[PDB]
Amino acid sequence: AMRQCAIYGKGGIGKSTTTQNLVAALAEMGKKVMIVGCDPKADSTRLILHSKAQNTIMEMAAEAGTVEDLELEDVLKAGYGGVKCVESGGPEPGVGCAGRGVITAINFLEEEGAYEDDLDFVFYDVLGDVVCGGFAMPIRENKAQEIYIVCSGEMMAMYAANNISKGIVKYANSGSVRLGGLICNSRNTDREDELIIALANKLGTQMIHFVPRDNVVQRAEIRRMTVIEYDPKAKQADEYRALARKVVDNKLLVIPNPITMDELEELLMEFGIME
Amino acid sequence: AMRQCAIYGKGGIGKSTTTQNLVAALAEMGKKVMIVGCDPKADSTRLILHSKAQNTIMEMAAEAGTVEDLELEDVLKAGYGGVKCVESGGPEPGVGCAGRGVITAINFLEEEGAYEDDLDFVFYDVLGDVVCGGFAMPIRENKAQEIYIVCSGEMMAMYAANNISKGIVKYANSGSVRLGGLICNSRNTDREDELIIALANKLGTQMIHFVPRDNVVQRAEIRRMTVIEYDPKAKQADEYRALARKVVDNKLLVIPNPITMDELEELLMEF
Amino acid sequence: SQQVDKIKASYPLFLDQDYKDMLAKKRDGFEEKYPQDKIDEVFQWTTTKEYQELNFQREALTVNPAKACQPLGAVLCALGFEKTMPYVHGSQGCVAYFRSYFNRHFREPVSCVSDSMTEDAAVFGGQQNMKDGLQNCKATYKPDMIAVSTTCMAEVIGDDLNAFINNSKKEGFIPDEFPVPFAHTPSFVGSHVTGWDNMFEGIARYFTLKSMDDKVVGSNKKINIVPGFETYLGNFRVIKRMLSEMGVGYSLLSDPEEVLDTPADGQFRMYAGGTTQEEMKDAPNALNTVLLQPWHLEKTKKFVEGTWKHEVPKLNIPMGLDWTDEFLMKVSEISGQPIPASLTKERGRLVDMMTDSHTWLHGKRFALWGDPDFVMGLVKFLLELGCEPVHILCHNGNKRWKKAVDAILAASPYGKNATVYIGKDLWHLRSLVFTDKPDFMIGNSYGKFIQRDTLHKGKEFEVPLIRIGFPIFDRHHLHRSTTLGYEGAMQILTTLVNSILERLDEETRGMQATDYNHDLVR
Amino acid sequence: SREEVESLIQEVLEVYPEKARKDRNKHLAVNDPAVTQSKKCIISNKKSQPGLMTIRGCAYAGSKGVVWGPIKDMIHISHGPVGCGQYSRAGRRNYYIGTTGVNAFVTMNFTSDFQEKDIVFGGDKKLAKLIDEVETLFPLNKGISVQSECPIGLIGDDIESVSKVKGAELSKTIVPVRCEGFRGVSQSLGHHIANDAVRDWVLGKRDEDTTFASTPYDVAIIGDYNIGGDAWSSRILLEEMGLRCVAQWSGDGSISEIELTPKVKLNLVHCYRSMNYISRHMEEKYGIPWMEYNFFGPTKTIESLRAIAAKFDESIQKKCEEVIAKYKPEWEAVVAKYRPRLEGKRVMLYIGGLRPRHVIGAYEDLGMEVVGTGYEFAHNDDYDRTMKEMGDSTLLYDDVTGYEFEEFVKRIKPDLIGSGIKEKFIFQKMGIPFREMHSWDYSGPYHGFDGFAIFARDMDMTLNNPCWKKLQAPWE
Numbered sequence A: 001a002m003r004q005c006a007i008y009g010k011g012g013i014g015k016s017t018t019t020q021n022l023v024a025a026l027a028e029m030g031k032k033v034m035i036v037g038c039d040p041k042a043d044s045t046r047l048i049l050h051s052k053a054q055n056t057i058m059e060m061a062a063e064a065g066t067v068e069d070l071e072l073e074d075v076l077k078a079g080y081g082g083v084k085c086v087e088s089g090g091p092e093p094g095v096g097c098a099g100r101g102v103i104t105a106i107n108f109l110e111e112e113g114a115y116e117d118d119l120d121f122v123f124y125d126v127l128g129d130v131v132c133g134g135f136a137m138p139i140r141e142n143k144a145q146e147i148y149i150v151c152s153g154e155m156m157a158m159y160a161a162n163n164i165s166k167g168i169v170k171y172a173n174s175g176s177v178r179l180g181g182l183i184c185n186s187r188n189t190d191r192e193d194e195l196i197i198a199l200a201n202k203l204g205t206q207m208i209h210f211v212p213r214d215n216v217v218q219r220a221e222i223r224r225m226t227v228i229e230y231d232p233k234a235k236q237a238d239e240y241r242a243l244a245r246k247v248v249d250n251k252l253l254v255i256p257n258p259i260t261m262d263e264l265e266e267l268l269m270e271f272g273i274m275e
Numbered sequence B: 001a002m003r004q005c006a007i008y009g010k011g012g013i014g015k016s017t018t019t020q021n022l023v024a025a026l027a028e029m030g031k032k033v034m035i036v037g038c039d040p041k042a043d044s045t046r047l048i049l050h051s052k053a054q055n056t057i058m059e060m061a062a063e064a065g066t067v068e069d070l071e072l073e074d075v076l077k078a079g080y081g082g083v084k085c086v087e088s089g090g091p092e093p094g095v096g097c098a099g100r101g102v103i104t105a106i107n108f109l110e111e112e113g114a115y116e117d118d119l120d121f122v123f124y125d126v127l128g129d130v131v132c133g134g135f136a137m138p139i140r141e142n143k144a145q146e147i148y149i150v151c152s153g154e155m156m157a158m159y160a161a162n163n164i165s166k167g168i169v170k171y172a173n174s175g176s177v178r179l180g181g182l183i184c185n186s187r188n189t190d191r192e193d194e195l196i197i198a199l200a201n202k203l204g205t206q207m208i209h210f211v212p213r214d215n216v217v218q219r220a221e222i223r224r225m226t227v228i229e230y231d232p233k234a235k236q237a238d239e240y241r242a243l244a245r246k247v248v249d250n251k252l253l254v255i256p257n258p259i260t261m262d263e264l265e266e267l268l269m270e271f
Numbered sequence C: 001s002q003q004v005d006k007i008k009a010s011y012p013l014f015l016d017q018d019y020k021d022m023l024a025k026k027r028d029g030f031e032e033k034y035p036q037d038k039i040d041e042v043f044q045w046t047t048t049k050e051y052q053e054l055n056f057q058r059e060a061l062t063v064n065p066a067k068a069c070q071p072l073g074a075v076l077c078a079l080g081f082e083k084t085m086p087y088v089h090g091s092q093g094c095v096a097y098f099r100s101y102f103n104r105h106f107r108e109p110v111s112c113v114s115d116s117m118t119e120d121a122a123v124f125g126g127q128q129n130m131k132d133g134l135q136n137c138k139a140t141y142k143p144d145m146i147a148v149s150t151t152c153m154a155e156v157i158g159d160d161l162n163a164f165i166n167n168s169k170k171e172g173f174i175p176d177e178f179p180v181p182f183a184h185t186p187s188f189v190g191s192h193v194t195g196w197d198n199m200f201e202g203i204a205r206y207f208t209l210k211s212m213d214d215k216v217v218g219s220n221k222k223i224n225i226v227p228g229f230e231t232y233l234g235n236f237r238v239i240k241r242m243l244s245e246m247g248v249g250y251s252l253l254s255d256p257e258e259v260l261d262t263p264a265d266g267q268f269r270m271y272a273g274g275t276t277q278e279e280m281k282d283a284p285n286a287l288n289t290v291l292l293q294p295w296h297l298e299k300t301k302k303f304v305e306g307t308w309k310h311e312v313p314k315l316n317i318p319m320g321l322d323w324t325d326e327f328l329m330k331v332s333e334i335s336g337q338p339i340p341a342s343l344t345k346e347r348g349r350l351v352d353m354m355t356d357s358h359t360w361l362h363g364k365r366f367a368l369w370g371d372p373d374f375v376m377g378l379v380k381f382l383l384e385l386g387c388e389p390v391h392i393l394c395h396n397g398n399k400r401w402k403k404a405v406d407a408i409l410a411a412s413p414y415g416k417n418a419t420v421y422i423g424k425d426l427w428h429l430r431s432l433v434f435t436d437k438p439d440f441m442i443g444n445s446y447g448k449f450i451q452r453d454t455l456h457k458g459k460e461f462e463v464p465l466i467r468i469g470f471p472i473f474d475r476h477h478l479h480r481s482t483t484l485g486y487e488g489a490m491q492i493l494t495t496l497v498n499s500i501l502e503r504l505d506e507e508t509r510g511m512q513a514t515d516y517n518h519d520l521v522r
Numbered sequence D: 001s002r003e004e005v006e007s008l009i010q011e012v013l014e015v016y017p018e019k020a021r022k023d024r025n026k027h028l029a030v031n032d033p034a035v036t037q038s039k040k041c042i043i044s045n046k047k048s049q050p051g052l053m054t055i056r057g058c059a060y061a062g063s064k065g066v067v068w069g070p071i072k073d074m075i076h077i078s079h080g081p082v083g084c085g086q087y088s089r090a091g092r093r094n095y096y097i098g099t100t101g102v103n104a105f106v107t108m109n110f111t112s113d114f115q116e117k118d119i120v121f122g123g124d125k126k127l128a129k130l131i132d133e134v135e136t137l138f139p140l141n142k143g144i145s146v147q148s149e150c151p152i153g154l155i156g157d158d159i160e161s162v163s164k165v166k167g168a169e170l171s172k173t174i175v176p177v178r179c180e181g182f183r184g185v186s187q188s189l190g191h192h193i194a195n196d197a198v199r200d201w202v203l204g205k206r207d208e209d210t211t212f213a214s215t216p217y218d219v220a221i222i223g224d225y226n227i228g229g230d231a232w233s234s235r236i237l238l239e240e241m242g243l244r245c246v247a248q249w250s251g252d253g254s255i256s257e258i259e260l261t262p263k264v265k266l267n268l269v270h271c272y273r274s275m276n277y278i279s280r281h282m283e284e285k286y287g288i289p290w291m292e293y294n295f296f297g298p299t300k301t302i303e304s305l306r307a308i309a310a311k312f313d314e315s316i317q318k319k320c321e322e323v324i325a326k327y328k329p330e331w332e333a334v335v336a337k338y339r340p341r342l343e344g345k346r347v348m349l350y351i352g353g354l355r356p357r358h359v360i361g362a363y364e365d366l367g368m369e370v371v372g373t374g375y376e377f378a379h380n381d382d383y384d385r386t387m388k389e390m391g392d393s394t395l396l397y398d399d400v401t402g403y404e405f406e407e408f409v410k411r412i413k414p415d416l417i418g419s420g421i422k423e424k425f426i427f428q429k430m431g432i433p434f435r436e437m438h439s440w441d442y443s444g445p446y447h448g449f450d451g452f453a454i455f456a457r458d459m460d461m462t463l464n465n466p467c468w469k470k471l472q473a474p475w476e
């Protein structure tokens, strides 16, 4: 069975870097994988692609002026490890609904035949800051069966994670969408791991991995390539292998029980973020 | 006569915190202000109010069940220094548009008469991460004339700043919307200030004020009060008065020239 | 000006010279109307083959649809039950429209209520409206049962009906025991027929799901009949009369005939007749369940076969001579009761009317449209009459159904020029009648306009509209007709032959021109 | 009596649960002709209580159904699922002259026909495709309007951009209109949304054009929808008086007439509720004054012709008198024939916004007394205008529920009831003669002098029809 996964989180927390690196590792293992970034930035397919920018379905559909008129080979281009990298992209700001461009892209990808291509895994990069129907569309359609939330020691990430879990609960009766786990990215906080696991426990799902903050991602990134590809031997390369291993190995998908702002507020002080 | 300004930024960067402080400095100054928060977080009105949570128009209107049914006094409550605070609120995750909640909340106040109350300033705490019709609604109807964006040394704050500036650009012919300034929040970056101004210059607006990171800010927040209010004698407290002094003083509203991602790459790389 | 002795209504009042002069001045002076020659040039263009192609090439614009939304289907079905008030969760404008569309076709009052969800209700959800609505409606109208359906605003925001209804009972707004079956009825998905199917499976499911152990199949020795979405009273009446004639015990689930037909005796009756709650509860005890219109009764077929374990027989809507023979024989096999002499006489009479009217009917070309079961039934009957149905259109139809009809057409030498179109509107049909011309059009009142357009091209190009179907708003009491059974077939046969004879008379009425063929005996 | 009517209101309200009962009492009042302000007497234009069977339509009905639909040249797309366009097609008789489907499209139903793919993905791409399709198929249309159904506001579709971009591409005016059903509480906000839509996208096009030649006598009928040809009968009277009618809003209207409206010297407003928003705007932007007038019945028409003529010079005033002289023998003949027939008969009316107050003069012209009247979605300024017209101690109801209406009618016992289609079948059953006020029961026009003859004749045939005697069976 081909698999669909989503990385949702507060912007700037490493959703793209973590998603791309995990897929590089799976690409290292040999699972056939496809990455679609639903985030408007589109730097999501950059490390795997080795391209400064990736032209999107949205950009490509325009000029062309018709969505089905647009060709698949031009739209989807294969990366390192043979992983397909594609970009949903989106509208010029203030016009229409942004999450909407995400939906036309998956539809385009489904209609043009990307799935059932025996790709072992599919990864979605999504902006986790706001949940509304365009964004919540992957949650609405059963676009991604398993959802992983990147979050950190800061209060904003936990609000984002908590916010996304509330999304899953609403689309739970309709869908097969379930939250997989909570990925964790270190900001070099005092007790990031202990805090994330407590929240994961409060949320009802396991924190999948602790990803250490390292200067090595940055070096690889400026080179415009992934850590696993750049220094297979590197310590950060092993950690990303582990997340990849943990995600394939993990069998626990659960409908989240969201915590209140007070519970989130109370739990940050329990580790002493706030007195 | 009356100027309404809206604070925009990435989540977690200080807009609720920055706005509250600037407004309390303004209130201490005697200016009459109303703060309407468009952010789903709704922690926007917390420091001036000294309340754990402020019931949103949406939370109050839901129990009542209808919007004109609900009372203005219960919805709008007076803060410290006489400042008016209200939460726009919003929808349950995955339902309707989060951004629409800003719109019904703003129209309810116009109909209820919050405006034309001889209020000197109106500030909108707004979520700056995603530019959407619903989120960029204050930009579309001329809810706010001058927009101030909170930005810092990282990639995300500068990008969100650029995006919000992209939004102000699309609605320039219909509206009177202009970018008021760029307020820089310290990420304790090595060359954060030169970077914001450099990012700012290319953009077309001068960074209005540089705000340092202080533990005084953290401490005032736990007591559920503003910095200006908790410690008047403080440097950070005096800093906020500078931004507030600068906001009254600044008379420069410019239509932004959105910058390209790469220039942002050369620029981040320059400092 | 008006002579008081003979007052003139809009027509022919505006036909007066002062008004004619005024309109022209208005048209010439401020309308900036395209020249009549241009209008003429454009009109002749739409009648062409070239335009049909561009018209049939449409992928996004629907002009003059032949289908309506789901809640209409849901409200009609809810009306079938005793002392039951249809209740629609969502915005109110929908309820006003359903009552009016129903009022005009049935010329009877239609009772329906809404919880009235607003803009504010859109952000919070439909929870308050549902509790207050359920509480207010019950106190005010005293319905025994309230059946909930939902409007598209409600479907898009995603209010949970089951959760809302339970919390209303839980919070104490309405009793725990008070029946409140509910069915989600998205207007974007399907049609009113699907809407009808959903409401019914929901009502059937609410009454029979919790208790199935006590129920044993064939224990009550009655046959459940599920009508489907039906707007002809004679149909409910005919199905009951024949089962009654045959002596077969039966339960008609969702019978809206008494309420849609209450007498004007000085007192207004909000509720009349209907299927009883007990009839609904004791339904699984039937020998079998027969569905009259199977194409839109698919969800209900799944619940009845799966939950009640009834083996629903495959039978076409009992229209025409063959289908009605099949329905009766089948009822005879399930009931164990024989088809009586009385019914066999009726069939004989239908055949006699067929032999008597065959020459006029033979070879006539018809373009027809409607809901899929009805169209399918009509197509089968016309072929049995030897008529040729050229254009068959079902807007709310599907691929399986189209496949089914083509098979029917293939079986008869008569179905040779016949083509089935689905997902195509009346605008498409207009083009079809103009490019390939049927003798007649069988359809609802929306076809009055297609007829008007054809007469415009010419007298000879006009296709008269024969009304059978729903909605019919320009004629009175046709909803009292019957299309099912032998009786229905007889009514349909008389209307078609007489429609054809009425037309021939019009064409031959010219004095010393065509009156040579204006015969006394036809 | 006042105590009796007050008791009747209290008595009826007993059935309702408390939140609903408390709210409803605010909407039912015994009329005092003396009161200046409506708010003391009655409250109005509030969200309806759920489950009570209110007669109110949605905002889509007010915008698509009443203001926009009547324009003949333009094409109106009902954007959303298939039902709204379908229920409303050819429902209302706003009469127009044109070649349908070729140059005039009023009876036609044009829809985006949303399916779930559209609800999930959104309808903008489809609306644009529909706009292109609309253009190839119907080449002579002079405009396009998109009427938003309920799902449009909810799914986040931006129709303004599509309308702006296509319009630009086709050099055609496309008016996006946000009349989502959930917005507002009655057909009323729709009028405003529609009025505002007309003003932003269609009114100012000939802002700088001075080519059209304008006489000082030019006038525009605002808010007359030509139901049954009401506007035409109203229009001929103004023309005979010497005024020139540049535009009709919006019955039998054309986009060219609307764009030429601001050129007119005076705006005559027949329906205050529906188009007063546009009238005020025109007075602020162009300085054109607007006056409310009533053409129902000979008395209102004479009074109205007189008022309009005063706003003009003596030639017009003189012409006004000739016309009143000309139609005087016609109307009085109607009065002589039908007043003895309808005298002293009590009437109860329920209609949405303009008519409950307006047809009162005509009924009185026939000697009929209007015992009670109400409004489906009328504002309080509408109610301020109503009490002077209504007699003392007469019953007034706003957003009357079906149950309230039946109980009021059973107690009051009016000879004839004027109301809409939903209300009509219940009353006939009850044996009370019913005339539909909205559609003029497929008759009309009821406006003007010509309209009045039809109206007197119509009240008389229905009120005195032999079928009412026949309801109780002879065998007890």
Ligand SMILES: Nc1ncnc2c1ncn2[C@@H]1O[C@H](COP(=O)(O)OP(=O)(O)O)[C@@H](O)[C@H]1O
Pocket (backbone or CB within 6 Å): A010, A011, A012, A013, A014, A015, A016, A017, A018, A041, A185, A186, A211, A212, A213, A214, A215, A217, A218, A221, B155
């Ligand atoms: N484990 C890590 N250690 C150190 N830096 C990291 C790590 N993961 C990500 N980063 C850096 O932090 C930033 C956030 O990652 P990114 O995917 O770009 O953000 P988002 O997906 O939230 O927009 C990038 O600049 C990246 O180089």
Ligand SMILES: Nc1ncnc2c1ncn2[C@@H]1O[C@H](COP(=O)(O)OP(=O)(O)O)[C@@H](O)[C@H]1O
Pocket (backbone or CB within 6 Å): A155, B009, B010, B011, B012, B013, B014, B015, B016, B017, B018, B043, B185, B186, B211, B212, B213, B214, B215, B217, B218, B221
């Ligand atoms: N100038 C500052 N000095 C110290 N702490 C700050 C400062 N600005 C913000 N913070 C802290 O950082 C967090 C994020 O800012 P906040 O206003 O809450 O986010 P948002 O921008 O999403 O409204 C708060 O918890 C606040 O205490």
Ligand code: CLF
Pocket (backbone or CB within 6 Å): C069, C070, C071, C091, C092, C093, C094, C095, C097, C150, C151, C152, C153, C187, D058, D059, D060, D061, D080, D081, D082, D083, D084, D085, D087, D148, D149, D150, D151, D179, D180, D181, D182
């Ligand atoms: S409040 Fe909504 S805008 Fe108003 S009139 Fe109703 S519909 Fe339309 Fe309805 S009939 Fe069905 S459920 Fe929708 S699609 Fe249309």
Ligand code: SF4
Pocket (backbone or CB within 6 Å): A096, A097, A098, A099, A100, A130, A131, A132, A133, A134, A135, B096, B097, B098, B099, B100, B131, B132, B133, B134, B135, D155, D156
């Ligand atoms: S649904 Fe989301 S993406 Fe769409 S307009 Fe609303 S906030 Fe923006």
Ligand SMILES: [Ca+2]
Pocket (backbone or CB within 6 Å): C106, C107, C108, C109, D425
């Ligand atoms: Ca009847």
Ligand SMILES: [Mg+2]
Pocket (backbone or CB within 6 Å): A015, A016, A017, A039, A041, A043, A044
């Ligand atoms: Mg990213």
Ligand SMILES: [Mg+2]
Pocket (backbone or CB within 6 Å): B015, B016, B039, B040, B041, B042, B043, B044, B125
């Ligand atoms: Mg905030």
